[PDB]
C-alpha cells in the first residue's frame, strides 16, 4: 500500500558503466509494462555529451547486470539530461536545448506526442544543485505520470504537474516553496514530492516533503547515502517500491519503507 516515506536502505550497485559517457545517466523499468516488455525489461541511457540518442534495452535483468543490450534504440532527436522515465510502453524524455517533453513509443519507435511544459525553465535555469541541465525531471508514482520543474513565476521553487500520459496535457499543478537548485534531486511517492539534500555526501538526507493531497510541507532527516559521491539521477519506481539512481558511473537501487 501507500504511506509516508520513513526509511531508505543502503544503495546496491547493479551495474557500473565502463566509460566516461556513463558518468551520469538514467536507468529505469516500466511500472506498467506492456507487450512485448515485462517487469524485467530495463532501459539505460548514458547521458554525457551533446548528442545523446542511444537507448540501451535489456529484456532480462541478467542481461542488464552482466551482458550486452538486447536492442538499441536511436532516438530521432537528442535527449537532455537525466530526467527521463518509461511508462506504459513509452519513453518520456526532454528534447535537448528545449522545454519539450516527447513521448516515444518503444516497440514501434514512433513519436506519439510532444508538449512544451508551459513556462518551464530549461538548459541551466532551474537545475538541481549539481547542474547537468536537470531543469525538467519526469516522475512516475502510484497515480501515473508527473513532471517536476520550475518557472520564473515560481521564482525557482519546485513546481510539479500531473501529466496525461497519452497527449502530455497538464492536468493539475502544485507550487512548493523548495528552491529547486538547492536540492540534489527529487521524486514522488504516493503523491508526495521528496527531495534529497546532497549529491556528494555519504550522510545526505531526504530533507523535504510536499504532500499534493494536503498542501502541507515538512522537513525530514531520513539518511540517504551517495556511495560514489556524484548522484545525477534519483527516481522512484512504484511497482518495485524502490529508488533507482545513477551515482558516478554506478546504476544503484535503494529499498524504502512507507508508513
Ligand atoms: Ca528525479
Ligand atoms: Na525522472
- DSSP H or E stretch at residue 21: none
How do beta strands 100-105 and 90-94 pair?
antiparallel
How do beta strands 170-179 and 185-189 pair?
unpaired
Q: Which DSSP category does 122 fall into?
A: -
| Dist. CA 161 → ligand 1 center (Å) | 14
- DSSP H or E stretch at residue 65: helix 61-66
Q: Which DSSP category does 249 fall into?
A: T
Number of domains in the chain: 1
Resolution (Å units)? 1.4
Pull the grid cell for residue 43.
532501459
Query: Which residues neighbour 155 within 8 Å (Cβ) at sequence distance 6 or greater?
Result: none
Q: Judging by beta carbons within 10 Å of its beta carbon (0-12, 13-18, 19+), is residue 43 exposed, middle or buried?
A: buried
- Whether a cis peptide bond, with omega within 30° of 0, leads into 36 is yes
Q: What is the largest CA-CA distance in the chain?
A: 47
Known binder of ligand: residue 152? Answer: no
Pull the grid cell for residue 252.
544503484
In residues, how long is the chain? 259
Pull the grid cell for residue 188.
514522488
Q: Which residues share a beta bridge with 107?
A: none
Separation CA 110–CA 90 (nearest Å):
9
Deposited experimental method: X-ray
Separation CA 233–CA 253 (nearest Å):
11
Q: Which listed ligand is nearest to 101 at the C-alpha?
A: 2
Pull the grid cell for residue 157.
521553487
Separation CA 202–CA 210 (nearest Å):
24
Pull the grid cell for residue 36.
512485448
Separation CA 223–CA 200 (nearest Å):
13
Pull the grid cell for residue 130.
549539481
Known binder of ligand: residue 167? Answer: no
Q: Which listed ligand is nearest to 243 at the C-alpha?
A: 1
Beta-strand runs (E) in 99-240? 100-105, 110-116, 137-141, 144-149, 157-163, 170-179, 185-189, 192-196, 204-211, 217-224, 231-237
Give the position of cell 566509460. 19
How many Cβ atoms from other residues are within 10 Å of residue 49's Cβ?
Answer: 10
* Ion ligand 1 residue ranges (Cβ < 5 Å): 137, 185, 187, 235
For residue 41, the enclosing domain spans 1-259
Pull the grid cell for residue 42.
530495463
Known binder of ligand: residue 202? Answer: no
Separation CA 251–CA 145 (nearest Å):
22
Question: Are the C-beta atoms of 138 and 145 separated by less than 8 Å?
Answer: yes
Separation CA 217–CA 47 (nearest Å):
32
HSE of 138, CA atoms in CB hemisphere, 13 A: 33
Instruction: For residue 180, give the 3-state DSSP assignment.
Output: helix
> Nearest-CA neighbor of 116 among 137, 105, 135, 102?
102
> Nearest-CA neighbor of 79 among 105, 50, 107, 103?
50
* Ion ligand 2 residue ranges (Cβ < 5 Å): 83, 137-138, 235
Query: Which residues neighbour 197 within 8 Å (Cβ) at sequence distance 6 or greater?
Result: 183, 184, 204, 205, 206, 207, 224
Separation CA 20–CA 22 (nearest Å):
5
Q: Which listed ligand is nearest to 232 at the C-alpha?
A: 1
Amino acid at each position: 500500500g501507500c504511506g509516508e516515506l520513513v526509511w531508505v536502505g543502503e544503495p546496491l550497485t547493479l551495474r557500473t558503466a565502463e566509460t566516461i559517457t556513463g558518468k551520469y545517466g538514467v536507468w529505469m523499468r516500466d511500472p506498467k509494462p506492456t507487450y512485448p516488455y515485462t517487469q524485467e525489461t530495463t532501459w539505460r541511457i548514458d547521458t554525457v555529451g551533446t548528442d545523446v540518442r542511444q537507448v540501451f534495452e535489456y529484456d532480462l535483468i541478467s542481461q542488464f547486470m552482466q551482458g550486452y543490450p538486447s536492442k538499441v534504440h536511436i532516438l530521432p532527436r537528442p535527449l537532455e539530461s537525466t530526467g527521463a522515465v518509461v511508462y506504459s510502453g513509452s519513453l518520456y524524455f526532454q528534447g535537448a536545448e528545449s522545454r519539450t517533453v516527447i513521448r516515444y513509443e518503444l516497440n514501434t519507435e514512433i513519436v506519439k506526442a510532444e508538449k512544451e511544459i508551459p513556462g518551464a525553465g530549461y538548459h541551466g535555469q532551474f537545475p538541481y544543485s549539481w547542474g547537468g541541465y536537470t531543469d525538467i525531471d519526469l516522475a512516475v508514482d502510484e497515480a501515473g505520470l508527473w513532471v517536476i520543474y520550475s518557472t520564473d513565476e515560481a521564482k525557482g521553487a519546485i513546481v510539479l504537474s500531473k501529466l496525461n500520459p497519452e497527449n502530455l496535457e497538464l492536468e493539475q499543478t502544485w507550487e512548493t516553496n523548495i528552491r529547486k537548485q538547492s536540492v540534489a534531486n527529487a521524486f514522488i511517492i504516493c503523491g508526495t514530492l521528496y527531495t534529497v539534500s546532497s549529491y556528494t555526501s555519504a550522510d545526505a538526507t531526504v530533507n523535504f516533503a510536499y504532500d499534493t493531497g494536503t498542501g502541507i510541507s515538512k522537513t525530514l532527516t531520513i539518511p540517504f547515502k551517495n556511495r560514489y559521491k556524484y548522484s545525477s539521477m534519483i527516481d522512484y519506481n512504484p511497482l518495485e517500491k524502490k529508488l533507482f539512481a545513477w551515482d558516478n558511473l554506478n546504476m544503484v537501487t535503494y529499498d524504502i519503507k512507507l508508513s
